[PDB]
């Protein structure tokens, strides 16, 4: 009995879904629940295993689609330039090393083999290209052996991919594919032929031979949603909702517009055994929009995306009168409202200061005005820091997010102890805050009116800085934090697999 998690792709810099998975893998270990993680995309740029391992996936949890048909195992790239040239013939006259691209010329007839290396300093070659008379004709990819290669030809005097072959440990061909218009249009096995990736994915999941007690969990639907649904009917199927499932600005009393990434799953929800939402705020309403609009009653389960390991009680003096914002910085941020409402709150409050961690787009315009504004030296500036322990050295946290599906920095914040102010908006600020108790939730009008909130920020800022509340609602801010930490996650994650299979 296994739990197969399905996702499309992965990368060095990757985003909430992948981490919600990688995280989910670690709990599922601790329960002894066996689980694999399937990835459907074509990932040759990196070796697949490097990306999986970085995010924290064990190699015995990784099913790569195109690998699964071979005896080769998910592995780090151990193949060396030494080994690579044992396979090439002749002798290299002159090397050349620019960063990670190192190549050796065989000018007699005009050849060279260009190598691309895992790390600039090491010798483990990730892939090699064979160029003869100026044209790429072959490219091989390595882990502990060549697990695949690519064949090329000139077209429009541009190197063009026509074929990609996959091999077993011994170099016998497992299967190959044709490439036209940058799409995979044919797959040829010894006993099979397939004309579309959609029908390849069906074969793969039939080869898994899913059975009644296995659980398939679909984290991304694009291109695979229909085939996963059909082949998962024998097993238990479930769909997880990352971010927000509908659009209220396009909905009405009789007609709701789902987000285009969950529409198929919601439309077909009678094929799904259970749904997974980040917050029970989402289980709350999506349960009723299933009731109101579609009259369907699919089982929905709340399982947070992160966890707290330990309630973090600081042993240092609480620094009175300070501030912070940690978010991934863009326009959607809207902390020019956090910038201004600090100036507009600095008049009445002693020596207060905020730190802005996270950097990116728009960082230019926040520096633009924070200097010409009143508190220039008493609001912070510089970027990335790992705040894993530093939250507790603070007083309050500031979020102008119009949307958060699950706040992760918020997740850390309440465990670390800060009171919390944010708009009353789905779903994170609503599941992490009460407007007595932890904090204040600012109701927001339907449109951007700047001085609306900038004054409406200051008034709940000061109601807490006034005694006795600031530490009052901090210290029971944790009695809710006691549900979002690991032992409770492993409870419900555990909890969920059993009532799924008693069905």
């Amino acid at each position: 009995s296994t739990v197969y998690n399905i996702n499309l792709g992965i990368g060095w810099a990757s985003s909430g879904v992948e981490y919600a998975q990688a995280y989910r893998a670690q709990i599922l270990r601790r329960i002894q629940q066996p689980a694999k993680f399937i990835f459907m995309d074509m990932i040759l740029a990196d070796n697949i295993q490097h990306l999986t391992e970085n995010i924290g996936f064990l190699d015995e949890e990784i099913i790569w689609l195109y690998n699964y048909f071979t005896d080769i195992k998910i592995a780090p790239t151990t193949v060396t330039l030494d080994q690579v040239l044992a396979q090439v013939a002749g002798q290299p006259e002159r090397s050349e090393k620019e960063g990670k691209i190192v190549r050796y010329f065989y000018p007699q007839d005009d050849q060279f083999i260009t190598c691309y290396l895992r790390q600039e300093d090491q010798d483990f070659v990730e892939h090699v290209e064979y160029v003869s008379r100026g044209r790429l004709i072959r490219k091989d990819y390595f882990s502990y052996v060549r697990y695949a290669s690519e064949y090329f030809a000139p077209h429009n005097d541009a190197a063009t991919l026509y074929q990609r072959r996959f091999y077993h440990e011994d170099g016998s061909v497992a299967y190959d594919m044709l490439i036209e218009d940058g799409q995979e249009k044919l797959y040829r096995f010894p006993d099979r032929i397939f004309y579309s990736k959609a029908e390849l994915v069906r074969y793969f999941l039939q080869c898994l031979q899913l059975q009644a007690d296995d659980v398939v969990i679909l984290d991304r639907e694009t291109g695979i949603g229909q085939v996963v649904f059909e082949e998962s009917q024998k097993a238990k199927l479930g769909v997880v909702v990352h971010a927000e499932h509908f659009s209220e600005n396009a909905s009405s009393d009789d007609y709701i517009l789902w987000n285009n990434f969950y529409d198929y799953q919601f439309t077909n929800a009678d094929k799904v055994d259970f749904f997974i939402v980040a917050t029970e705020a989402q289980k709350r309403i999506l349960e009723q929009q299933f009731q109101h609009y579609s009259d369907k009653q699919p089982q929905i389960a709340t399982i947070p995306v992160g966890s707290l390991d330990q309630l973090t009680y600081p042993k240092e003096p609480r620094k009175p009168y300070s501030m912070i914002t940690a978010s991934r910085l863009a326009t959607e941020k809207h902390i020019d409202w956090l910038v201004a409402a600090t100036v507009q709150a600095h008049a009445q409050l002693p020596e207060l200061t905020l730190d802005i961690y996270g950097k990116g787009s728009e960082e230019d315009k926040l520096r633009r005005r924070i200097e010409e504004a009143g508190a220039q030296d008493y609001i912070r500036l510089k970027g990335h820091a790992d705040l894993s322990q530093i939250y507790a050295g603070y007083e309050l946290y500031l979020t102008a997010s119009t949307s958060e599906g699950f706040g992760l920095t918020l997740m850390e914040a309440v465990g670390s102890g800060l009171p919390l102010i944010g708009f009353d908006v789905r779903y994170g600020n609503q599941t992490f805050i009460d407007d007595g108790k932890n904090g204040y939730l600012l109701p927001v009008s339907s449109n951007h009116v700047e001085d609306q909130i900038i004054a409406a920020f200051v008034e709940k800022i000061i109601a807490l800085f006034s005694q006795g509340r600031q530490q009052e609602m901090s210290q029971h801010s944790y009695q809710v934090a006691e549900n979002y930490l690991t032992s409770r996650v492993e409870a419900a994650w555990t909890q969920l697999l059993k009532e799924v299979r008693d069905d």
Partner: protein, 447 residues
């Protein structure tokens, strides 16, 4: 009295709504098989099918019944049915204020050619399927009862219409005219006068009724060119036909009509207009409202810096590219993205102009809704139609006088500076008082 319209569209609605204002409420017949008809009207194709009247709850794009597990997707202009990613149907949107309502779903074969068109009404039922032979030529169309029985089979190659109603024997009608005629007699409609909007079957019902006594009016709404339509002649040349009267609400063509009609021959052209029901007066205030699908609005940067006093509100129900999200750098601009219908109404209160400046397709009859709300409309020669509602004086070249709007626009400086301008677009749309119908007609409309 009856009004018989070939098609249902706004031009026939305006004509219909005007006549109703002037005291003409008769029964109204649309020949077209249109599934979303105002309860005002009926059609012989939809009339016998058993649908419950006064129900508006159409299908939503993802409620199209499909084979199990087949995948329905769609954007704001269209939708799709797929089997393992391969295209199967196209779902076409009924054009309504509400978006993504199912009008017609077009099924394809595996080579992608059109085969079936299954048609939906305002009640969400599929009342008709059209079948296509090889060249994507229409073979026939079947119209079903609410029990799924053949009420009407219209052969598109021969024209033969096979009418089988419930518990009645089978009747074959050699032509569309003969079918409409059965419908008029069947409903016992009073034929004093037939007011109709075109030279298609709605006319040929009249031309073929000459044996019976009465006189009918044709409201000619289409454009005119080098000649008259051949058939617009035989109403002038023949003196016996039931219709001796050609009403032409658009002036500009009425002149082109009088131009091509002979001196003897211009006694038959009456000219009129439409009586619009406007929602409120102007008030000459500070605010812009533009509805765009995506960028960029031609010459927005130009106009906005040059008139900083004017509020600029731009909306879409899509999301906006940072190309335009760049322009809200100005405190002079206000931008509404993924705009609600509720929000889009509010902006039609709070803005007294509509600049038709955007590129691409039109956003929910925005030019019309502006006209109904007495917003003064201007733009450049690439306008999202309608051209009906914008006056020549107000239109511009494609940024040839890039901004010459702004201070021709700025002729908003007070009350009769404007009241001029909205009679300019008011005239161009051929607005007339309800009285002008009463005068122009009872010299004809007797019986």
């Amino acid at each position: 009295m009856i009004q018989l319209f070939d098609y249902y569209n706004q031009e026939t609605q305006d004509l219909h709504d005007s006549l109703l204002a002037a005291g003409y409420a008769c029964p109204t017949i649309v020949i077209e098989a249109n599934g979303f008809l105002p309860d005002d009207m009926i059609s012989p194709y939809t009339y016998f099918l058993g649908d419950e009247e006064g129900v508006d709850h159409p299908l939503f794009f993802n409620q199209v019944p499909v084979p199990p597990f087949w995948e329905i997707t769609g954007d704001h202009q269209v939708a799709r049915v797929s089997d393992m990613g391969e295209e199967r149907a196209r779902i076409h949107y009924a054009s309504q204020a509400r978006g993504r309502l199912v009008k017609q779903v077009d099924w394809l074969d595996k080579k992608g050619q059109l085969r079936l068109s299954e048609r939906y009404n305002k009640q969400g039922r599929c009342f008709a399927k059209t079948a296509y032979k090889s060249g994507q030529e229409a073979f026939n169309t079947t119209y079903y009862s609410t029990d799924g029985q053949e009420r009407i089979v219209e052969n598109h190659v021969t024209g033969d219409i096979i009418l089988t109603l419930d518990q009645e024997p089978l009747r074959i009608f050699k032509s569309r005219v003969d079918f409409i005629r059965f419908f008029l007699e069947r409903l016992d409609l009073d034929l004093d006068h037939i007011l109709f909007n075109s030279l298609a079957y709605s006319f040929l019902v009249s031309h073929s009724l000459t044996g019976r006594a009465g006189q009918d009016i044709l409201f000619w709404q289409e454009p005119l060119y080098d000649e008259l339509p051949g058939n617009m002649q035989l109403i002038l040349d023949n003196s016996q036909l039931r219709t001796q009267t050609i009403v032409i609400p658009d002036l500009a063509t009425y002149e082109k009509a009088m131009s091509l009609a002979a001196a003897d021959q211009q006694q038959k052209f009456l000219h009129l207009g439409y009586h619009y029901d406007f929602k409120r007066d102007n008030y000459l205030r500070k605010d812009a409202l533009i509805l765009t699908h995506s960028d960029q609005i031609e010459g927005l940067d130009t106009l906005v810096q040059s008139l900083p006093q004017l509020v600029f509100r731009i909306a879409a129900l899509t999301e906006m590219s940072p190309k335009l999200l760049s322009m809200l750098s100005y405190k002079n601009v206000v931008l509404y993205q993924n705009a609600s219908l509720k929000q889009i109404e509010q902006l039609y209160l709070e803005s007294d102009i509509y600049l038709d400046i955007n590129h691409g397709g039109q956003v929910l009859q925005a030019v019309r809704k502006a006209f109904e709300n007495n917003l003064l409309i201007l733009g450049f020669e690439q306008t999202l139609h309608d051209r009906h509602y914008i006056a020549q004086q107000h239109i511009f070249d494609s940024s040839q006088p890039a901004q010459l709007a702004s201070i021709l626009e700025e002729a908003l400086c007070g009350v009769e500076q404007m009241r001029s301008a909205l009679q300019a677009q008011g005239r161009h749309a051929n607005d007339v008082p309800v009285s002008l119908y009463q005068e122009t007609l009872q010299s004809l409309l007797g019986g």
